[PDB]
Each structure stands twice: as structure tokens, then as C-alpha cells.
């Protein structure tokens, strides 16, 4: 039978929290209803194509936890506060672009630097769009909305970096119209050996459909390699070629990247509450590391010559 019960101060699922629920809790937690029915993620035939896909690539993942939904973004970002934060950071970057343009920064880079940018920087737009696609995939497959929310914002950050690169490629080409800036990046991504490790890495990562393996390979192998092997060496090369804008822009992008590493590590910490997950995660890191290392090595020998 049905009893009488009083109104609750928050959602019925938070109503046993000790602390007063935050904005983050209220709008982010336990929103994937597709994990409720293990036989029918989606309200359709149990063997519909997308039901099979999710039962295979989410529910059946070797990476297992009995309460994914208790995962918490260490940054507790919501849409509102992401836009406040990134409007501040992106307004700062746009102001840098405006001011460094006024100062005709690009005319004073070391002789030849435009050629190094056209080879090693402007085709990053492909790489970053791969991050973007791949983040969107972890979003749609992750088994808790608090995980997926982190991926959504990471997907937006990828597009942010993509757009920086597009903007600067075009701007650089105005001072240097005879380096193929804005013209030859697809040929470079497809045929230049320094790009082929990365391109092989992402094409294979983009076809890893298990949500766990997708997350591990993207966030724990590929993206840390980009930070150490692409972002930071590029800042150093800029330093030696009198490009003082690139280091500042890359320090803004590194804030984003550090934030991705933060939620990633927090998700690892949550998954490792289950002891089996150590061998699962470590297995996938070993699987993907040699591609990542190969990618890095080819990129740096292209950059450093």
C-alpha cells in the first residue's frame, strides 16, 4: 500500500546526503536512465541495434564498478561555471591575439619559424579534432552522467584548441603567405612521417569502442603524451625562435589539459575501489603505450629537425 510522506528538501536520490546538495549535485548526478535496465538500456526492442551496442561496449566492459554514479568531478563544474571560467580564459587569449597582432609579433620570429609552424603546428588542428571526436565518444558511452559531463566539457575544450590553431594558422599566413599555412595541413597529416605515428594512434583509438578502453586510451595514454611530447616541446622551440605568443597560448591550453588529467585521475581513483580494475586499466595502458611512444618520437624528430 501507499504511505504518506513529506516533501523532501532535494531530489529523492540526494535526500540522504548529509550535506546540503550543491548546484553540481543537483544538476549533474544520476541522469543516465540508460543504465537502469541491464537488458534494455534504451526504451525499445531489447535487441535493437543501439541496445546491442550499449550492452556490448558499456555494460559488458571489463572495467567494472557497482556505483559509477558516485563519481565526482574534482572541479565540480556545471555548464554555467564552465562558461564563466572559459569566457575569462578565452577573453584573455583573444586579448593576447589582439595585442600581439598590434605589435606585429609575427614579423619578429626567428628566420624560418613560419616553416616550422606550418609543418609542426598548423596540422594540430587534425589531432585536436581527433581528441574532440574521441571525447564525444567517451561522453556518449560512459556509465554515469558525472563522467559524461566531464567528457562533454573536454569535448568543448578540444574544439577550443582546434579553433585557436585555425585562427593562428590563418593569422600567421598573412605575414607569411608562402609557407603553405592553411593550404597543406591535410597533406601533412596524411603523408608527412612526423605526423604518421599520431595519425595511426588516433585512427586506432577512435575505433576502440569499449567505454573503458576508450576512456583509458584517450585520457590516460594519448592526452598525457600530447602534454609532454607536443605542448611542452613546442613552448621550448618557440622560446628559441622568439615566438613569445605561442608559449602563453599553450599555457592557457595546458590549464584545460591539467583539468582533464584531474577528472581522469579522480575516475581512476573511483574505479580502483574495485580491485579487479587495477589489472584491467594497467592492461589497457600497456596495450596503448607503444603507439603513443612511437607517435611522440616521430613528432619530436620532425619538430627538432
Amino acid at each position: 500500500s501507499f504511505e504518506s510522506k513529506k516533501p523532501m528538501r532535494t531530489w529523492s536520490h540526494l535526500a540522504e546526503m548529509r550535506k546540503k546538495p550543491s548546484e553540481y549535485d543537483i544538476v549533474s548526478r544520476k541522469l543516465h536512465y540508460s543504465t537502469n535496465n541491464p537488458d534494455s538500456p534504451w526504451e525499445l526492442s531489447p535487441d535493437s541495434p543501439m541496445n546491442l551496442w550499449y550492452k556490448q561496449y558499456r555494460n559488458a566492459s571489463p572495467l567494472k564498478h557497482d556505483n559509477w554514479d558516485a563519481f565526482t568531478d574534482p572541479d565540480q563544474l556545471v555548464y554555467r561555471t564552465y562558461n564563466l571560467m572559459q569566457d575569462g580564459q578565452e577573453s584573455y587569449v583573444q586579448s593576447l591575439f589582439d595585442q600581439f597582432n598590434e605589435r606585429e609579433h609575427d614579423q619578429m620570429v626567428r628566420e624560418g619559424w613560419e616553416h616550422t609552424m606550418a609543418r609542426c603546428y598548423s596540422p594540430l588542428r587534425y589531432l585536436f579534432h581527433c581528441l574532440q571526436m574521441s571525447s564525444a565518444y567517451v561522453q556518449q558511452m560512459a556509465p554515469a552522467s558525472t563522467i559524461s559531463n566531464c567528457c562533454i566539457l573536454q569535448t568543448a575544450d578540444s574544439l577550443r584548441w582546434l579553433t585557436h590553431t585555425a585562427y593562428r594558422t590563418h593569422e600567421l599566413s598573412l605575414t607569411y603567405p608562402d609557407a603553405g599555412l592553411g593550404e597543406h595541413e591535410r597533406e601533412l597529416w596524411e603523408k608527412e612521417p612526423g605526423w604518421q605515428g599520431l595519425r595511426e594512434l588516433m585512427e586506432k583509438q577512435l575505433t576502440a569502442f569499449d567505454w573503458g578502453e576508450a576512456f583509458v586510451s584517450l585520457n590516460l595514454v594519448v592526452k598525457p603524451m600530447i602534454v609532454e611530447s607536443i605542448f611542452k616541446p613546442l613552448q621550448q622551440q618557440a622560446w628559441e625562435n622568439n615566438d613569445t605568443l605561442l608559449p602563453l597560448l599553450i599555457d592557457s591550453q595546458l590549464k584545460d589539459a591539467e583539468r582533464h588529467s584531474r577528472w581522469s585521475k579522480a575516475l581512476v581513483k573511483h574505479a580502483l575501489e574495485n580491485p579487479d580494475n587495477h589489472a584491467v586499466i594497467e592492461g589497457w595502458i600497456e596495450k596503448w603505450r607503444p603507439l603513443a611512444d612511437r607517435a611522440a618520437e616521430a613528432y619530436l624528430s620532425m619538430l627538432s629537425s
Partner: protein, 491 residues
């Protein structure tokens, strides 16, 4: 100096390349991508007509939210919850319950495109679309959350998609079919074109007009702000349709639009129809449900569909007749079975309202009016047992909504049935049966709530057993007449 967006926009979507370490098909599998065999190079002509870029996006969306939250904050003491007509409060409750977590599901339709569309401009506009639906899911959880402490039915803003309540099943069956349950190109066409340039304008602008008349500006300001995002990311679908038509796939495109518009129609008739013609107080009804339909779906949406080179759907005349009829019957079902709803339906049949209904739908009193004559007589004579049901409606195997017809003097009702794979299915229209036949693997083993009741899954097999199954956790949560029958006094 800054350089104008026109000068660098092309590089932002110059992101297609020719795969070599995996095949194109592996990278864009058809079951997720739905490219219909159209090669990568043809997709590069896709040109989103409503562009944005990342620095503009974060700036502008910061401003949109600043205004939405400010207005909520400034009007918290206006006493909407206490001073509004209870039919208006019920409209809020169904809206948030039927939409909030469905918005958050839509993140996944946009993510499907961001990853699996072969059109580069689509993948970027989908990335903003992901962000937009995230906004919409968070807004429509945050806004109703302050009413939790007033009324447990507001807990269904969060809870409804987690339940097996009949209307939440109808909503999830629809959204999982058009948003989360198909390939990227199907989402472009069925969600962003068909649903989001068609019907969402009804719920989010037609209803806003009624909210503004009802003096609820927090809600009107919220939902019209939401629709400004939709107006941008809905423009992903046109360019996909145009491309499909240019590459020989007009027929497939047309079938997907026809199916999505019908599916959207049946759900909006059961949620938005009763709201607009019955729950919204008479003097707040900006237009009737049918008038709004003719403005938004016939005058605006259908004209856009024709402009893009598609045809009126094959069922157009059925549709037009349905606009005159279906929601009056759906209202009646929701109201008679109010105890299975998480809001409080208003009957909306005081003599004044019935005069309005008759003006907006000539012949109403000799049809639905005949039913409401009996009900109203039982209420006046305090025969309240005759006003609660003792069995279940039969339910559509497509829309998940009860099977209805025209009652009274010219009674007509029709069920369209189908045997398939050793099972008997029932549908509430020719079109719903056709939708099933268009893709039986999507639907065939799905069981509607009545199928489940008869198969032993709802225990005990009683109305109470069903209310429990539907997720109700206290007596206060089940729907009641919005005015506790006070309308009978006006009769």
C-alpha cells in the same frame, strides 16, 4: 587587430582526412554513422547555415544564463507556486518531468553526430549542440528543484525518466527512438530537423506565450531562452537533408522525416494538447492548441520542409483530422486515469470553457461533451467511484499512449492491428503501424505497460500493483483533479 570569422572559419572545419591505418567504414561504421554509403568527400560540401565559434559561444552563453538565473532569483517571492491556478502548477510539473532528463538524453544524440558524422561542420556544430543540451538539462533540473520542498510531484523533474510511469515510457520510447537509438545522420534528420524545427517551438514558445499570460515570467523567460539555442543547433538537419537529396537518398530522407514528425505528434498531443486547451486557465490561453499547430507546424514547419525540396508527408490529411480530434481524447484519458500521472490534471470543462472549446472546435459538445456530461453529473451527485477507473486503457505499441477515438453522437474509433513474428500488436493510427513496419528490429520485442501487466511482470496484477510498478513512492505523488472538483460548482 582581430581577424573576422569569415576569414578563418573554413580552417575550423577542415578536419576530414583519408584514413589509412583503419578503413573509412571502420572509422565511420554505418550503424553509428548512417552515411548510407555516401563517401567522405561528398560530406565536405555540408555547410551549417547558423555558425558559431568557441570564443563567441562561451561569451554569448554566459550572457544567456546570466539573464535566466537573474530573473529566477528576482522573482522567487512572486508566489507563483501559491498564487497560480493549480492547472498552471500542473503544467510546470508535467513539463519539467517530461523534458528535463530528455534534454540531458539529447546530449547523446548530439554526441552521436560529433563523433560519427562524416560532415566536419556537423561534428563541430554538434559539439556546441552537446553543450546546449547540457545547459537545457541543467536548467530544467535547477529551476524546479526549489519546489521539491513544496510538493513531492516536483521530484519527478528528476525521477520521471527513472520510472516506468506510462507517460515517462511514452517519452522515453520516443526520445530513445529518435535521439539516442539511431545513427548520426538519422539523428540529424529526425531530431534536429523534424523534432527541433517542428514541434519544440510549440512546447517552448507556444507554452511561453501562455506562461507570460499566466504571469509566470521566470518560466516563460527560461524556456524562450532555451529555444534560442535550439534555433541554432537545429540548423544541422537542413544541410544533411540537402546532401542526402543531392546524393540520391531522397526517398530514405523522406521516410525518416515522415516517421519522426508522426512520432513527435502523438507525444505532443498527449502532453502539450491538454496543457494548452485545458490546464492553462481559460483567460491565459493565447491561442488554442490547434491554432498554435497551424502557426508553428503547418505554417512555419511544413513550409520549410517544402522549401528544402521534400514532400508533404503521405499521411497529411490524417494528420490534419487528428489535430481537430486526438488531444481532446488524450486529455480525457490522462484526466480519467489522473492517479497514474505525476501531475494533477485539470478537467477544464466548466461551462465557460466548454463555450470556448466549442468555438475552437465546433461540434465538441456533441462529442467529448457527451462524456463530460456523465462525469460532471457523477461529481455533482457525489458518485466519486464512477470517476475513478477500475481497469487499464489499452495502449498503442508504438506511441505507448491509450487507444482513443471520437466519442458521442458520431462515435468513431479504430485500432490498427498487426501480427508479426507470432505476436499480436495494436496501434492507434495507420501511421503508427507503418512506423513499426518501417523498422521492426527497433520495436518488435518491446513490451508496452499493458503487455507487461498481462505477462505477469506487474505484481500484484492490480491497479495498485501497477501504480507501484510505475514508481510512485507516496500517496501525495499520484495525480488528482487539479481543483479538487471545485469546477463542478461552476456547473
Amino acid at each position: 587587430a582581430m581577424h573576422p570569422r569569415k576569414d578563418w572559419y573554413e580552417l575550423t572545419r577542415a578536419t576530414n582526412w583519408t584514413p589509412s591505418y583503419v578503413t573509412e567504414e571502420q572509422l565511420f561504421p554505418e550503424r553509428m554513422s548512417g552515411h548510407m554509403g555516401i563517401p567522405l568527400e561528398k560530406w565536405e560540401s555540408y555547410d551549417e547555415p547558423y555558425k558559431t565559434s568557441y570564443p563567441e559561444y562561451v561569451s554569448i552563453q554566459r550572457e544567456k544564463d546570466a539573464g535566466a538565473y537573474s530573473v529566477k532569483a528576482a522573482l522567487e517571492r512572486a508566489k507563483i507556486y501559491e498564487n497560480s491556478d493549480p492547472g498552471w502548477i500542473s503544467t510546470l510539473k508535467s513539463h519539467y518531468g517530461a523534458i528535463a532528463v530528455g534534454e540531458y538524453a539529447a546530449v547523446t544524440g548530439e554526441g552521436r553526430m560529433a563523433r560519427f558524422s562524416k560532415a566536419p561542420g556537423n561534428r563541430n556544430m554538434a559539439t556546441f549542440g552537446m553543450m546546449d543540451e547540457l545547459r537545457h538539462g541543467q536548467l530544467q533540473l535547477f529551476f524546479p528543484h526549489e519546489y521539491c520542498k513544496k510538493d513531492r510531484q516536483f521530484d519527478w523533474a528528476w525521477r520521471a525518466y527513472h520510472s516506468n510511469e506510462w507517460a515517462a515510457i511514452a517519452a522515453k520510447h520516443f526520445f530513445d527512438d529518435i535521439i539516442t537509438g539511431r545513427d548520426a545522420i538519422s539523428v540529424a534528420i529526425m531530431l534536429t530537423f523534424s523534432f527541433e524545427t517542428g514541434f519544440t517551438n510549440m512546447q517552448f514558445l507556444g507554452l511561453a506565450a501562455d506562461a507570460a499570460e499566466a504571469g509566470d515570467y521566470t518560466f516563460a523567460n527560461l524556456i524562450s531562452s532555451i529555444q534560442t539555442d535550439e534555433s541554432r543547433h537545429a540548423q544541422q538537419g537542413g544541410p544533411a537533408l540537402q546532401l542526402l537529396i543531392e546524393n540520391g537518398k531522397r526517398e530514405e530522407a523522406q521516410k525518416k522525416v515522415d516517421m519522426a514528425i508522426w512520432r513527435a505528434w502523438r507525444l505532443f498531443a498527449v502532453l502539450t494538447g491538454p496543457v494548452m486547451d485545458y490546464y492553462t486557465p481559460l483567460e491565459d490561453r493565447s491561442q488554442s492548441f490547434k491554432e498554435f499547430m497551424y502557426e508553428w507546424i503547418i505554417g512555419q514547419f511544413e513550409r520549410s520542409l517544402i522549401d528544402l525540396g521534400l514532400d508533404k508527408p503521405w499521411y497529411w490529411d490524417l494528420f490534419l483530422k487528428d489535430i481537430d480530434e486526438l488531444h481532446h481524447s488524450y486529455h480525457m484519458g490522462v484526466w480519467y486515469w489522473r492517479t497514474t500521472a505525476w501531475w494533477n490534471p485539470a478537467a477544464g470543462v466548466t461551462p465557460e470553457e466548454r463555450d470556448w472549446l466549442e468555438e475552437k472546435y465546433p461540434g465538441w459538445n456533441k462529442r467529448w461533451g457527451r462524456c463530460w456530461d456523465v462525469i460532471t453529473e457523477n461529481v455533482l451527485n457525489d458518485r466519486m467511484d464512477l470517476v475513478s477507473p477500475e481497469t487499464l486503457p489499452s495502449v498503442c505499441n508504438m506511441s505507448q499512449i491509450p487507444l482513443v477515438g471520437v466519442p458521442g453522437d458520431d462515435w468513431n474509433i479504430e485500432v490498427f492491428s498487426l501480427e508479426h513474428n507470432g505476436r499480436l500488436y495494436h496501434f492507434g493510427s495507420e501511421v503508427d503501424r507503418w512506423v513499426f513496419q518501417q523498422d521492426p528490429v527497433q520495436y518488435q520485442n518491446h513490451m508496452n505497460i499493458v503487455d507487461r501487466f498481462l505477462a505477469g511482470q506487474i505484481q500484484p496484477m492490480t491497479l495498485e500493483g501497477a501504480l507501484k510498478y510505475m514508481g510512485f513512492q507516496s500517496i501525495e505523488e499520484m495525480g488528482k483533479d487539479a481543483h479538487d472538483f471545485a469546477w463542478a460548482d461552476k456547473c
